[PDB]
Amino acid sequence: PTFNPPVPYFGRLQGGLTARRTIIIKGYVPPTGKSFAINFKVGSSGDIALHINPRMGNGTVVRNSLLNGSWGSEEKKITHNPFGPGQFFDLSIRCGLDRFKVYANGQHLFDFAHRLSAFQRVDTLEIQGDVTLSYVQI
Numbered sequence: 001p002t003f004n005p006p007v008p009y010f011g012r013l014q015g016g017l018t019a020r021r022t023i024i025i026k027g028y029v030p031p032t033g034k035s036f037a038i039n040f041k042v043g044s045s046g047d048i049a050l051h052i053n054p055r056m057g058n059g060t061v062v063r064n065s066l067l068n069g070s071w072g073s074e075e076k077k078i079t080h081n082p083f084g085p086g087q088f089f090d091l092s093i094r095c096g097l098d099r100f101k102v103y104a105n106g107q108h109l110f111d112f113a114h115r116l117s118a119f120q121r122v123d124t125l126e127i128q129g130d131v132t133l134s135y136v137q138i
């Protein structure tokens with residue numbers, strides 16, 4: 001469902017991940033949270049075009065890919081951390097031709113260059129771990 005979906009979340013993106021398709025995720029990080037993940041998955045393989053992994057221990061926003069069975073190299077640079085324990089966040093994820101563009105609370109968070117060139121393979125949005133979702137629009 002769109003409002004208050006429980007975690008873990010499993011959303012079927014109908015007709016694949018489309019260029020210009022925007023995902024909105026509004027949620028809350030618990031005081032006790034250590035980690036949660038948002039994966040843009042291809043179901044057949046289990047490959048992940050984009051794994052976004054906020055980790056509260058170090059306050060990192062980890063981005064990586066799981067392609068051909070292997071983890072790529074991690075991208076971590078941010079200008080802000082919207083995922084502090086006990087915080088609400090509003091994430092807007094846009095799938096561009098060349099990159100994902102992610103904004104948190106209307107402020108740019110990161111861009112992630114496509115590693116899976118064929119982004120249309122992605123038909124699975126997965127959100128899992130220590131996060132409470134108020135709203136997910138796919």
Ligand SMILES: CC(=O)N[C@H]1[C@H](O[C@H]2[C@@H](O)[C@@H](CO)O[C@@H](O[C@H]3[C@H](O)[C@@H](O)[C@H](O)O[C@@H]3CO)[C@@H]2O)O[C@H](CO)[C@@H](O[C@@H]2O[C@H](CO)[C@H](O)[C@H](O)[C@H]2O)[C@@H]1O
Pocket residue numbers: 037039051053062063064071074128
């Ligand atoms: C053990 C574990 O946590 N496994 C998770 C897995 O996480 C890995 C992922 O976050 C990558 C991204 O780069 O980092 C891995 O940690 C690395 C450190 O970041 C790095 O500094 C160090 O040098 O090396 C570490 C090891 O590689 C981290 O382990 O993430 C995947 C994707 O979400 C998880 O798979 C999913 O698991 C859920 C249940 O939790 C479901 O079973 C799903 O089917 C599956 O996609 C995995 O559990």
